[model samples]
Target: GSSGSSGEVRLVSLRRAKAHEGLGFSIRGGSEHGVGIYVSLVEPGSLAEKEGLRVGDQILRVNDKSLARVTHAEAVKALKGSKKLVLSVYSAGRISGPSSG
Candidate 1:
């Protein structure tokens, strides 16, 4: 994950044996502007919300693999391929203080 102004890197892990359950979030890959794999939505009452993931939080890595150059399809594949999901994230406008995960 990228460093924040406070030099903090946040990592979150969420696991569900079934893909149907999901991580409870959606992500969109970067475009011609720059590299960015960011959270688009975090469903309420879901793992993502409980874990403090919010919209616009950048996802720098997925399960130890860097998402810096990954395409939308690739990111989706990487996310869906694992039952254990680990996300290295960076957020510029975090709503609350960081929480231990």
Candidate 2:
């Protein structure tokens, strides 16, 4: 289980676009025999990129929900349930997010 470091939460606001505007990122869930959800891709020029999201980042949580051991559909549902998505991510042995000025 990859838990993000302290204060590694990235808050991203997404609109309900006709095509796509939610997070601008896709996720790949592990099998029932496995654990953790991973970020498959981060669309360039999208809000996700602007928010500093990157591919291969592990998703620890979405909004207020913990994604540990969650299925693919469950993770997707959690992402779609909110316009303001607060993601807790772990990457490269550390946790990071858009800097707060």
Candidate 3:
């Protein structure tokens, strides 16, 4: 039985990459609904990074579904797949914010 745990697949090490293979989403307090979050960097050459995702990009939805009710794992699953995937994202570039030098 294939438990889908074969060591053949090369997975990126989160420790070495300093980035998780998933998107980060959170709910705001006192808000009637949930909103997408913006990330500074998705790790160089990562799935998200290669997808043209950048800092200040809002994750409005995942798999065309509202992110408010989706769990972190669900979001990750949405972004992950056996083959390459294309994700639709909305983003805005900002000039006034603390950045890494």
Candidate achieving the largest lDDT = 1
**What ranking of all candidate models by lDDT puts the best one first?**
1, 2, 3
lDDT of 3 at 69: 46
On a 0 to 100 scale, what is the lDDT of residue 88 in model 3? 47
lDDT of 3: 0.41
Between candidates 1 and 3, name the one with more favorable TM-score. 1
Residue 94 of model 3, lDDT score: 32
> Which lDDT tens digits does candidate 2 get at residues 1-101?
88645445455454454345456887886545376787888899887767667787778878878888777778877776465568777644443565333
CA lDDT, every model vs. true structure: 0.74, 0.69, 0.41
Please estimate how well model 2 matches the true structure, expressed as its whole-model Cα lDDT. Answer: 0.69
Candidate 1 lDDT, 40-96, residue by residue in tens = 888898878777787878888899888786667777777863857798787554345
Better by lDDT, candidate 2 or 1: 1
lDDT for residue 49 in candidate 3, whole number 0-100: 55
Per-candidate TM-score against the hidden true structure: 0.75, 0.68, 0.39
* Per-residue error (Å), model 3, residue 9: 32
lDDT value for model 1:
0.74
lDDT (tens digit, per residue) of candidate 3 on 11-61: 221222223444322212111234343344565655455545655455555
